[PDB]
Write a protein that binds this ligand. Structure first.
Ligand SMILES: C[C@@H]1O[C@@H](O)[C@@H](O)[C@H](O)[C@@H]1O
Ligand SMILES: C[C@@H]1O[C@@H](O)[C@@H](O)[C@H](O)[C@@H]1O
Ligand SMILES: C[C@@H]1O[C@@H](O)[C@@H](O)[C@H](O)[C@@H]1O
Ligand SMILES: C[C@@H]1O[C@@H](O)[C@@H](O)[C@H](O)[C@@H]1O
Ligand SMILES: [Ca+2]
Ligand SMILES: [Ca+2]
Ligand SMILES: [Ca+2]
Ligand SMILES: [Ca+2]
Ligand SMILES: [Ca+2]
Ligand SMILES: [Ca+2]
Ligand SMILES: [Ca+2]
Ligand SMILES: [Ca+2]
Lengths: 114, 114, 114, 114
């Protein structure tokens, strides 16, 4: 199934944060309404925060995460969880290799903010 | 129900990262084996990262998050999610006031690393 | 935090299913727009499906689960999880006693149907 | 990413329940020890329970769900959620066609029981 695609409420601020756990340099692109709105790159095997930013979901609410290593797309896994009917997390893992730890870039989207 | 308590695999490194969304300064304590292992603090209404660290779950694997604001413990909400049977998120929201957004301190624990 | 309350799409069918795991007879109430729409009951320590029903979420979409045992409300835990941005589960556990297994009545709400 | 595969605690009883929402007849296989341990089959567009059972996760704890329609394997989506560090849900959706509702067979695994 499609992964890394989330529908947020329109015109809503959200956080996006990326972590790296791989020998390869991760590139994370975050698209809002099919246009890149944030980009983070870096290498870590210690869960470095390679980027964290506040974005706006815009009129469409369409948010997509893409992960690649030197242009090669990683395979994605994702889900969303809502706590107390109010607090939202959109979660992404990605795999750049063969071990299927799916932590090579980890992306967390959270809303609402403020 | 108890919230903010998670059983990780023993002796396993994990990431812990906290975000703030409130007027009030958030103090986040992370306990491993019922001892404080990390403390983060800061203030933001824009989802700033107020701390991030790698810890070890230790022999018992017991990890607990607590949050205090303006002299009182915040009410917590939490869950754990596992993607593709490999990638683990332990998620915490917290409420320091009356609006029940539960985002006042948000804490993300993720494992495995590396 | 409040538990067992979910905002579903308005006017939409959903499934609700309850499982029992306790020496005590469970009573599960499902409220749509604050009025009882289904009630299930039974006594099992082996996950009996004491009820399953298709309901409509009505004009407001508000769905609430409550659980009682020997006329006493059980403590609830809950969350919602969304797979591939389309498939929704609202999950409830409940505790009638002292062991904190939270499985005494388990309720799963799923949508969309058809 | 692989879907429908879950690691349960070893030698632990768990519930498995399947629902149908499709014109096609669903066949749900549940594997423990990498061998089929239960099979459910039925057809409904109204979320009917097509089977429920209690199984033992065996020495490895590995549980797998597979779904087909008239011999054609359905595409799966899955995740595991843990509430209050105690109550586990392993959730599966499946798609047999083109609409990507992923509800054509829905499978809920829950543990612990009792
Ligand atoms: C150090 C290794 O780097 C890449 O091979 C990753 O795919 C592995 O998961 C591991 O992080
Ligand atoms: C700015 C406000 O600060 C505190 O009152 C928080 O509890 C509110 O959620 C909001 O973030
Ligand atoms: C048999 C026991 O019955 C009640 O005490 C439940 O609260 C326990 O969880 C257990 O199911
Ligand atoms: C009635 C329809 O039957 C199959 O085409 C399913 O894939 C659809 O989701 C729908 O349930
Ligand atoms: Ca990897
Ligand atoms: Ca890795
Ligand atoms: Ca608040
Ligand atoms: Ca807030
Ligand atoms: Ca109990
Ligand atoms: Ca019980
Ligand atoms: Ca379908
Ligand atoms: Ca369907």
């Amino acid at each position: 199934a499609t992964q890394g695609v989330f529908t947020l409420p329109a015109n809503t601020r959200f956080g996006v944060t990326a972590f790296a756990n791989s020998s390869g340099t991760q590139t994370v692109n975050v698209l809002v309404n099919n246009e890149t709105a944030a980009t983070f790159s870096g290498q870590s095997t210690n869960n470095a925060v390679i980027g964290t930013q506040v974005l706006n979901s815009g009129s469409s609410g369409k948010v997509q995460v893409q992960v690649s290593v030197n242009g090669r797309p990683s395979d994605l896994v994702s889900a969303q969880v809502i706590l107390t009917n109010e607090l939202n997390f959109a979660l992404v893992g990605s795999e750049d290799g063969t071990d299927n730890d799916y932590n090579d870039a980890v992306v967390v989207i959270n809303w609402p903010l403020g």
